[PDB]
Amino acid sequence: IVGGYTCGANTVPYQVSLNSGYHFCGGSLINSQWVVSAAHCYKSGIQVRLGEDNINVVEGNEQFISASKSIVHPSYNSNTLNNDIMLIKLKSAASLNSRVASISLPTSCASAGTQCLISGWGNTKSSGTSYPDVLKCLKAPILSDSSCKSAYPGQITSNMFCAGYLEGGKDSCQGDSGGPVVCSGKLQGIVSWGSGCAQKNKPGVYTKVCNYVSWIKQTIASN
Numbered sequence: 001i002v003g004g005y006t007c008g009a010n011t012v013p014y015q016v017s018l019n020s021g022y023h024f025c026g027g028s029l030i031n032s033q034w035v036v037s038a039a040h041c042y043k044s045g046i047q048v049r050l051g052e053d054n055i056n057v058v059e060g061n062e063q064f065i066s067a068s069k070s071i072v073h074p075s076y077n078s079n080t081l082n083n084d085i086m087l088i089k090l091k092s093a094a095s096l097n098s099r100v101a102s103i104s105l106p107t108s109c110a111s112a113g114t115q116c117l118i119s120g121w122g123n124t125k126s127s128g129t130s131y132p133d134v135l136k137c138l139k140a141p142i143l144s145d146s147s148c149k150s151a152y153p154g155q156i157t158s159n160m161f162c163a164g165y166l167e168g169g170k171d172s173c174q175g176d177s178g179g180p181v182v183c184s185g186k187l188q189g190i191v192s193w194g195s196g197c198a199q200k201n202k203p204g205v206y207t208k209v210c211n212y213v214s215w216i217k218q219t220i221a222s223n
């Protein structure tokens with residue numbers, strides 16, 4: 001997260017860290033047994049870490065649970081990142097509490113102008129590299145589809161939306177991928193891609209979760 005702020009320990013209880021010996025992507029807890037992340041975050045040997053703030057220090061509210069199964073969207077295209085969404089099932093149900101909670105799925109899509117909360121442990125620099133130990137937060141509005149498509153001609157599909165600021169300075173970044181974009185209490189996006197980080201006229205691109213609710217619910221119910 002570039003141009004953001006320190007969320008505060010466990011202020012984003014649904015935020016998860018995917019670990020394969022190190023933090024490599026974010027995710028969102030949707031119920032005690034399932035996590036939603038980006039398909040491009042797929043990897044074998046994933047351990048889901050919940051209740052995290054400083055990912056390099058055991059602070060006392062963590063829950064480390066190995067993934068038992070991963071399900072990348074049937075139509076995921078790694079070349080274009082269309083349908084960049086994946087589900088991860090926990091080997092054992094997480095113990096829900098004030099610091100480890102699920103985020104509700106949307107019942108309808110969000111409109112341009114809606115403010116959202118984007119979070120993660122990704123790079124905090126627009127130029128160069130610096131990875132934070134504590135969770136970073138960023139408030140950003142959903143942008144018009146036209147401004148999104150103008151920035152990335154021919155690359156934006158109906159399963160993607162842009163959020164952030166065209167002037168630059170505030171954006172999600174490498175390491176935040178797979179993480180949450182929550183608007184009006186609903187998980188509306190997943191950190192997916194973009195161009196550089198916090199660059200002018202190059203907003204972040206997010207997977208449009210409202211298009212996948214039917215798939216998510218049916219998949220979780222059958223697995």
Ligand SMILES: Cc1cccc(-c2cc3cc(C(=N)N)ccc3[nH]2)c1
Pocket residue numbers: 040171172173174175176177191192193194195196197198203204205
């Ligand atoms: C699979 C793959 C290949 C090459 C680049 C990316 C990527 C761009 C990007 C841009 C942002 C951003 N500035 N919001 C966040 C995460 C991001 N991930 C992903």
Ligand SMILES: [Ca+2]
Pocket residue numbers: 052053054055056057058059062
């Ligand atoms: Ca920790």
